[PDB]
Enzyme design. Structure first.
Site, PDB file in Angstrom:
ATOM      1  N   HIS A 107      22.707 -32.861 -10.905  1.00 26.76           N
ATOM      2  CA  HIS A 107      22.138 -34.188 -10.696  1.00 26.76           C
ATOM      3  C   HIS A 107      21.534 -34.345  -9.308  1.00 26.76           C
ATOM      4  O   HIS A 107      20.643 -35.179  -9.116  1.00 26.76           O
ATOM      5  CB  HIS A 107      23.205 -35.254 -10.914  1.00 26.76           C
ATOM      6  CG  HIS A 107      24.175 -35.368  -9.785  1.00 26.76           C
ATOM      7  ND1 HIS A 107      25.269 -34.542  -9.659  1.00 26.76           N
ATOM      8  CD2 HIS A 107      24.209 -36.203  -8.722  1.00 26.76           C
ATOM      9  CE1 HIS A 107      25.940 -34.866  -8.570  1.00 26.76           C
ATOM     10  NE2 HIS A 107      25.317 -35.871  -7.981  1.00 26.76           N
TER      11      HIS A 107
ATOM     12  N   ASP B 130      25.212 -42.840  -7.637  1.00 28.19           N
ATOM     13  CA  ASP B 130      26.259 -42.338  -8.518  1.00 28.19           C
ATOM     14  C   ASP B 130      27.047 -43.476  -9.149  1.00 28.19           C
ATOM     15  O   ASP B 130      27.251 -43.503 -10.375  1.00 28.19           O
ATOM     16  CB  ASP B 130      27.187 -41.412  -7.738  1.00 28.19           C
ATOM     17  CG  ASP B 130      26.513 -40.122  -7.333  1.00 28.19           C
ATOM     18  OD1 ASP B 130      25.713 -39.599  -8.133  1.00 28.19           O
ATOM     19  OD2 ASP B 130      26.781 -39.629  -6.218  1.00 28.19           O
TER      20      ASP B 130
ATOM     21  N   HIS C 118      19.467 -37.814  -6.078  1.00 33.19           N
ATOM     22  CA  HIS C 118      19.371 -37.948  -4.632  1.00 33.19           C
ATOM     23  C   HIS C 118      18.036 -37.461  -4.088  1.00 33.19           C
ATOM     24  O   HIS C 118      17.991 -36.890  -2.995  1.00 33.19           O
ATOM     25  CB  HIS C 118      20.520 -37.199  -3.958  1.00 33.19           C
ATOM     26  CG  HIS C 118      21.876 -37.641  -4.408  1.00 33.19           C
ATOM     27  ND1 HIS C 118      22.121 -38.902  -4.902  1.00 33.19           N
ATOM     28  CD2 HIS C 118      23.060 -36.986  -4.444  1.00 33.19           C
ATOM     29  CE1 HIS C 118      23.398 -39.007  -5.221  1.00 33.19           C
ATOM     30  NE2 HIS C 118      23.990 -37.857  -4.955  1.00 33.19           N
TER      31      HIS C 118
ATOM     32  N   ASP D 123      29.396 -30.611 -11.428  1.00 34.31           N
ATOM     33  CA  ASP D 123      28.063 -31.205 -11.440  1.00 34.31           C
ATOM     34  C   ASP D 123      27.358 -30.980 -10.110  1.00 34.31           C
ATOM     35  O   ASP D 123      27.655 -31.658  -9.121  1.00 34.31           O
ATOM     36  CB  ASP D 123      28.128 -32.698 -11.757  1.00 34.31           C
ATOM     37  CG  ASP D 123      27.060 -33.129 -12.730  1.00 34.31           C
ATOM     38  OD1 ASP D 123      25.980 -32.507 -12.730  1.00 34.31           O
ATOM     39  OD2 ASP D 123      27.300 -34.082 -13.498  1.00 34.31           O
TER      40      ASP D 123
ATOM     41  N   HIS E 249      65.984 -62.271  -3.190  1.00 36.53           N
ATOM     42  CA  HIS E 249      67.414 -62.534  -3.093  1.00 36.53           C
ATOM     43  C   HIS E 249      68.064 -61.972  -1.840  1.00 36.53           C
ATOM     44  O   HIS E 249      69.032 -62.569  -1.357  1.00 36.53           O
ATOM     45  CB  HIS E 249      68.160 -61.979  -4.317  1.00 36.53           C
ATOM     46  CG  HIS E 249      67.902 -62.731  -5.584  1.00 36.53           C
ATOM     47  ND1 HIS E 249      67.243 -62.175  -6.658  1.00 36.53           N
ATOM     48  CD2 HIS E 249      68.225 -63.992  -5.952  1.00 36.53           C
ATOM     49  CE1 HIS E 249      67.162 -63.067  -7.630  1.00 36.53           C
ATOM     50  NE2 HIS E 249      67.753 -64.176  -7.227  1.00 36.53           N
TER      51      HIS E 249
HETATM   52  O1  LIG Z   1      27.590 -29.045  -0.889  1.00 38.09           O
HETATM   53  C1  LIG Z   1      27.645 -30.221  -0.472  1.00 38.09           C
HETATM   54  O2  LIG Z   1      27.771 -30.582   0.714  1.00 38.09           O
HETATM   55  C2  LIG Z   1      27.540 -31.310  -1.552  1.00 38.09           C
HETATM   56  C3  LIG Z   1      26.604 -30.985  -2.711  1.00 38.09           C
HETATM   57  C4  LIG Z   1      26.990 -31.708  -3.970  1.00 38.09           C
HETATM   58  C5  LIG Z   1      26.062 -32.442  -4.699  1.00 38.09           C
HETATM   59  C6  LIG Z   1      26.410 -33.109  -5.864  1.00 38.09           C
HETATM   60  C7  LIG Z   1      27.719 -33.058  -6.332  1.00 38.09           C
HETATM   61  C8  LIG Z   1      28.663 -32.331  -5.616  1.00 38.09           C
HETATM   62  C9  LIG Z   1      28.294 -31.670  -4.454  1.00 38.09           C
HETATM   63  S1  FES Z   2      67.532 -58.651  -4.888  1.00 43.30           S
HETATM   64 FE1  FES Z   2      66.936 -60.038  -6.489  1.00 43.30          FE
HETATM   65  S2  FES Z   2      64.753 -59.777  -6.615  1.00 43.30           S
HETATM   66 FE2  FES Z   2      65.442 -58.130  -5.325  1.00 43.30          FE
HETATM   67 FE   LIG Z   3      26.558 -36.726  -5.262  1.00 46.61          FE
END
Ligand SMILES: O=C(O)CCc1ccccc1
Ligand code: FES
Ligand SMILES: [Fe+2]
Ligand SMILES: O=C(O)CCc1ccccc1
Ligand SMILES: O=C(O)CCc1ccccc1
Ligand code: FES
Ligand code: FES
Ligand SMILES: [Fe+2]
Ligand SMILES: [Fe+2]
Lengths: 443, 172, 172, 443, 172, 443
Positions: free
Chosen positions: A213, A361, A218, A210, A108
């Site tokens: 893992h 992951d 990895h 974590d 508008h």
């Molecule tokens: O310390 C790091 O550079 C990363 C290591 C890591 C591995 C998995 C999950 C988080 C951080």
């Molecule tokens: S002024 Fe009407 S939709 Fe924004």
């Molecule tokens: Fe990781």
């Protein structure tokens, strides 16, 4: 169709024994309650002050599922507004970033200033003979916006505590990255965006507590990446001591190392830059934090970062079973252009849609979410008993609750905070419950 | 603009590109690696949306890499799959490359030719997973004295501002 | 492997394949049936996932047919539609065949040539129904002394382990 | 949460007058109640003992919407487990079939034996100083698994009756196919999988009590197929007596024929093989069952098979408006390779995604499901009054409730069983209600 | 029955069509407008479903236009975008044209050639929007004495009875 | 569950102050209640008598989400039936239009006559020994079908008022288009169908009471179009007086002009035809309506048309966040073929999937619907305060409540009618509430 009363949050999670019911990862009523309370009352990351340097500069981001625009004001302040026209609810901005003097609705033609007031209304005397109060119909504004050392957070609720009190001890760990050198930090080269089909709790919990893992998930990346002389073996093999901080849902974790060494995934130039500037970092912070060039950190609900590769990650929930990831690369301002290019190449190689590490992951999270579709699958208990009962407070000067790096203290704390926020009306009740839980667990 | 090659060169270069794609589709990564030249540059960037005034001026929001490789990094990516511990590619993905609109032109450097094509990459994995990647592609090709062709460069364009797949474990 | 055909043969065989596809798209099944040779073999199989050890050895879980036809069974499939009582074909489906990456080579038998292409088949039916089938295809073609071509064989590959359409009432 | 009281199951179906309300085919709450009760308490088909001959062999299948793995043990037994790692709920197997010694989770590295116990936990002394009880964290196991003449069924609930009692009279009809020759049977050549957009009740009801449609739906196939000289007319045209068995939700149906003749869709070699081996089949079973080479049979909830073409079909529900079909081909073990190849060609030609017959059936089901999207469409009664009141018990030696083949006794019985299972807490109440219904209908 | 063109003409006309598509993909609408001939006719119609008896007779339910343009209306459509106030194309969409199955034939009028191709148009706009349009296309092309080609006509076929996109702001 | 008690309709909309809560545009329970009540009790457009001229001719259309077939009877009447076979609920027709003598179900073979009775049942004596009552199992019939000057409407409910009383004053505006010349009108050349991702209330309200947006949304089209040289300025600039009628949810709007002039988007031949035939139109109707060749109209819930370009638009809801548009072109029967071709070209150029004007409107609606996905986004009030308090009844002979064309009287009336129909059990209560609201607003 969704009722808070019929829901039994405390029934689903059992922190003391370490059991979790998978139904929390797939329930739509839980998702709506989360959108109402957790994202409504918690500080959320918005942007970096390097992205909006001059007045009138803006940046488009999200809070929960609501689009938000962050704009730098004339006097140097920062404001954030909701993307919605007060007449018929149409968005007023679409670009990723830029500079502007007013926002115009295309449907508008209502025009709003950068401060949010309604400056122009087409054919007002003919359309509104009785008169229109332009004061009432301004842009919806986020009441609380605040920046910590150059990172901008925002909150919808006034009753919630301030940014410093919300952070608490995790500020001591964030200061390790943000304050290495004089002059602060800045972002380098754009933002990466992609979509993953999993609940938002999976990556948050992993980046909270974590490290287990990385030994198995990895393995191939370590085997392959492991000509310049460097330590092929990862840092975790030769580390003497390890620390994990698991408090208030804020999680952190790292290893103790004799020398300042980044992980094997970084480039040689980045590690050389880290080694050359050790004296300034040690002087500004201290030996403990200066020697930490590897770890994981997560701020509740959805801010994640790693110390080595210098990456910031933000997760935006899109339904009970999807999430969208925005990835930024951040580095010290005083670094020269070549070092910043090296940082960008290293971060984009290691982490991203095509990185060596992110692929496995994302695959695991998507597989778990696919499995969680059967009645029997989401009614079986899951184990969270790592490092149970060994929590203690260190006396060597490191704040917070501390446990071994191979433990799930932070995951249990995050789930307790989730259950408390979801099942309380006021922030004071949440704080009282958190204090009671801490007093229980510490003794 | 750019001078177009004759019929024979167009035919031979098109057949070379088809052969490379077929090698990729049949899970023969060592031969595909043998195809590339030593100075290969493998590139992809991100996509952004800009204001009308910026588009009129030519300015854009800053972008960042997604792929940036030489031959050695591609060797590492191949070896990672060959180890047997890459859970992204276990079980392996099933892909098809479709190439169209081939335009070939000469270049200032002798025995080097510039190519532009459009591609659709179809990827299906596990059970009930499907993904289409559509875009354009620029290549440079070098001919040896023994009538064999090598790939010198590759720059890929993807039209998705927000990529809708959880990862990209396939070589474009 | 075998030497690639020259330009003229490539052109003629490509035009023949395009003509056959156009006949299929325009609902002319008698002419398409006239195109095929008496010893036509029309084949498609299923797709499976195997363990890493099996893939290293070369073993696979057992598979089964989906199409296995000669010319007479194709005649029966045509007549079934022509009766007017096939409720899968009422109303008829609207299809497009897209063919790409054509590689042609010679064969040991004289006057027989081997072809490999990639295909995308798009099928839309009734209102708001759309389906894409992407894959590869192998063919053998015979040339007569009067410069006419016949199709001797066809083996089709579909990349879906779990087919996501309720039926396949279209000839690939 | 989900309470049957808010729902009205008995209101939707009226068995005595023969009326059905279509809302049962599209209601999500009904679907969740079905997943909880019907698939939770009923025996479901898993595999064939020919597919797992040697110890360590496994096969991946489904129960309801839950992935399940069937593994042959060293002592000769068979066990079925749920595909879920006890730590973070990630799947441990993905291949279709094969041989293995242990299942390894890729996310963290927990390893399970074929018997299901947790044998390996990486870095256990460091991760779990207090100690971990490996006995409690084994794989979830299906408590009841049992095989009938080489077909493996499984049940989640211990309170449910045994396989023989659950089958009852339908065992007498299944034994007609399974016990034709010595050595039992075996599967030939792979499994066909595809997806249809319709509720799971449509194909189940059709394969329970529908011979009426073959007159009109498959007119074109009969006209075209009706090579070697054979009876052009189908079996139903020249048939004299017909039988339908409709008890406990188990349905079956066939025609009486003077000679052993398969249907017109089969190949000549298959019919010749059937005719040549008539003496052994007649001696083992009896004349009535030996002469039956056509008909339909269904076992509640989702097992279907036809006598002539030797096909087994299993339907897996995927939401209130989708289903996934797995098709197997099964034949006598003593048959030579050529006869088995003929069987495979015949079955794959007649039935499959590209079969002559399946196309029209799938089309009809999908069209009905598409129509059932309007408020008025799913509130109009449907007629189920075929053969009402003519039920009687035969005295010629054929067990069970019997009616003419052009009747809906089995459909009404299936819907009554559905309404009883969905609205009862215990199996004993279901059995009492079924006995009461049978006593009512028979008199 | 009209004779197919030779290799050289096929090559040149195919290259011309590829160049026009590339001009459309790169947001160069003035050059694309320069390509067209003065008597250009740009057409598209709707799609319907008919009874079996009607199909046997040849009758169908009545249809209606979707595009019906000359060069001047295309000029107006270009100028509308160039103004900067077209909210359908702000920000602009990103498109790719894929062309296949090119058949070229002669025509009764001298220096005019008839072309038939199959097309897939991929359109992605804003964030997380994707649309595929698949169909066939008929063209007529006129060659000038200076070996330059112009487009005389274009008739497009879309296979969707109920179009599944909110608007069509892209030139096919 | 959808029940009036749990929902709060009157809380969401505040007519007196002019506020709207966006939650009404995205709530599924609201959508199901709408399907039950608004589309169940309101007259809906079916077809035009020109599309079914001879007996046996039929046309396939929709009511709500239910497929409906309209058929011309032998005696000259018109009947509408639901597309559902009484046995197993399968559709009996699929073609867009044509001529037939009976409808045959393909699944089993039941055949129905054009009057709806069940004429044929295959193998009835064998299938139904007890006997079947063919009278009870006829096709479901729409009880109320009626045509106004050649436009066919239908209603599911007998208690609702007649077509003339349901229309009321809006008949006086529809008669302007329908009764310009002798012979009535007829449709020209096919129907256009496409899909938009937005709630039906957006286009309904815009075509009810929105002329404000044409100033800004369609600026580019006005600037470009000026097909040759014409009156460059649109009608609204030269117009002196403007009228908007906003009663009973029926809205209309137009401008007063000295001369009979169509808008700038139409072709010259159409305007020339209007100028040449102005005399007969003025004689039949009157000067006020004859000079009106521009404006907008709407009939509750989903019938829309514009006077200049001669277009009819029907919106079919498909879920809470989608709609399907069918567009017809209608013109006077006495016009020659060339004029009708000009009409078809003009209408298809201006309006359609590829029209100059429709693109921006569809874009705006889709953007608003995309935004309405956040918790905070759909809980913020929207303004409806245009022309508040200036309502009055004209004394110049124009019936109904009248206000300036730049006002939102009709939008507020439509929302009040929506809230009344959604929250009342009987039509009499709705009529009483509407009368009370009108008496209040007039004071
Ligand atoms: O310390 C790091 O550079 C990363 C290591 C890591 C591995 C998995 C999950 C988080 C951080
Ligand atoms: S002024 Fe009407 S939709 Fe924004
Ligand atoms: Fe990781
Ligand atoms: O006897 C047979 O082989 C098929 C007969 C049939 C007809 C309809 C449904 C199932 C089986
Ligand atoms: O008068 C006309 O032809 C169109 C005017 C108009 C403007 C906005 C919505 C509907 C109709
Ligand atoms: S996910 Fe299975 S061991 Fe952790
Ligand atoms: S489905 Fe219509 S007669 Fe049975
Ligand atoms: Fe059948
Ligand atoms: Fe408009």
């Amino acid at each position: 169709m969704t009722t808070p009363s019929d829901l039994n949050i405390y029934q689903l999670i059992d922190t003391q024994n370490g059991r979790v019911t998978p139904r929390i990862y797939t329930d739509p009523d839980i998702y709506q309650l989360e959108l109402e309370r957790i994202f409504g009352r918690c500080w959320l990351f918005l942007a970096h002050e390097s992205q909006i340097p001059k007045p009138g500069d803006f940046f488009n981001t999200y809070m929960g599922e609501d689009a938000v625009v962050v704009v730098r004001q004339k006097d140097g302040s920062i404001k954030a507004f909701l993307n919605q026209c007060r007449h018929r609810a149409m968005r007023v901005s679409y670009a990723d970033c830029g500079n502007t003097r007013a926002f115009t609705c295309p449907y508008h033609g209502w025009s709003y200033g950068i401060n949010g007031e309604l400056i122009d209304v087409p054919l007002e005397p003919r359309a509104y003979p009785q008169g229109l109060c332009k004061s009432h119909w301004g842009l919806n504004e986020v009441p609380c916006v605040e920046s910590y050392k150059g990172l901008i957070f925002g909150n919808w609720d006034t009753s919630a505590p301030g940014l410093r009190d919300y952070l608490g001890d995790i500020a001591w760990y964030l200061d390790g990255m943000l304050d290495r050198r004089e002059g602060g930090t800045e972002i380098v080269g754009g933002v990466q965006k992609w979509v993953i089909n999993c609940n938002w709790k999976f990556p948050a919990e992993q980046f909270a507590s974590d490290q287990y893992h990385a030994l198995f998930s990895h393995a191939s990346a370590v085997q392959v990446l492991g000509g310049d002389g460097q330590t092929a073996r990862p840092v975790w093999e030769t580390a003497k001591d390890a620390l994990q901080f698991g408090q208030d849902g804020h999680g952190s974790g790292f290893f103790f190392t004799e020398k300042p060494d980044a992980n094997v995934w970084v480039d040689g130039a980045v590690s050389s830059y880290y080694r050359e500037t050790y004296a300034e970092a040690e002087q500004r912070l201290g030996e403990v934090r200066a020697l930490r060039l590897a770890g994981h950190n997560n701020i509740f609900p959805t801010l994640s970062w790693l110390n080595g590769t210098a990456t910031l990650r933000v997760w935006h929930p899109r339904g009970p079973d999807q999430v969208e990831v925005w990835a930024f690369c951040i580095t010290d301002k005083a670094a020269s252009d070549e070092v910043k290019a090296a940082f960008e190449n290293s971060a984009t190689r290691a982490f991203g849609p095509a990185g060596f590490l992110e692929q496995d992951d994302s695959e695991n999270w998507c597989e778990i979410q696919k499995l969680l579709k059967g009645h029997r699958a989401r009614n079986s208990k899951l184990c969270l008993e790592m490092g149970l009962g060994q929590e203690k407070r260190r006396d060597d000067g490191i704040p917070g609750i501390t446990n071994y790096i191979f433990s799930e203290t932070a995951a249990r704390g995050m789930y307790q905070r989730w259950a408390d926020l979801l099942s309380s009306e006021s922030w004071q009740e949440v704080l009282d419950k958190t204090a009671a839980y801490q007093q229980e667990v510490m003794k | 603009m750019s001078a177009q090659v004759s019929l024979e060169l167009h035919h031979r270069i098109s057949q070379f590109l088809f052969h490379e794609a077929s090698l990729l589709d049949d899970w023969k990564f060592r031969d595909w690696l043998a195809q590339l030249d030593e100075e290969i540059r493998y590139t992809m960037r991100t996509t952004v949306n800009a204001q009308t005034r910026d588009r009129r001026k030519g300015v854009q929001p800053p972008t960042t890499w997604i792929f940036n490789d030489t031959k050695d990094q591609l060797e590492r990516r191949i070896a990672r799959l060959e180890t047997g511990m890459a859970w992204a590619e276990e079980p392996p993905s099933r892909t098809r490359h479709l190439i169209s609109n081939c335009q070939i032109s000469e270049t200032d450097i002798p025995n080097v030719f510039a190519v532009r094509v459009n591609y659709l990459l179809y990827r299906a994995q596990k059970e009930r997973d499907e993904t289409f990647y559509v875009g354009t592609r620029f290549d440079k090709v070098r001919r040896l004295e023994d009538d064999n062709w090598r790939l010198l460069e590759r720059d890929i364009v993807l039209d998705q501002a927000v990529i809708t797949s959880h990862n990209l474990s396939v070589l474009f």
